[PDB]
Amino acid sequence: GYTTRDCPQAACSQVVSMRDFVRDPIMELRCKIAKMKESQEQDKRSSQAIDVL
């Protein structure tokens, strides 16, 4: 409904369209590594707790 809209995030003042956006691998890599680290830490803590008992 709007041809151009201001960027919601701060530190910038510009209006961009849908076509301007391009895929960013950095964000997906950060999300994947965060998921892997949280999964591994949960597995290790559960294993250590069971080994203690």
Place this chain on the structure above:
Amino acid sequence: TKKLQATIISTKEDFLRSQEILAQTHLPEKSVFEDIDIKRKEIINKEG
């Protein structure tokens, strides 16, 4: 590994249930061997 972690959690729960069952002593009678000897004497006397 996740499956074995789940299984060992279940085994820990089973161990806790086993400890709860062990809370009931169910001690064997202190004189089972003595009663066996008494009945052996009784049967020997009865046959005599």
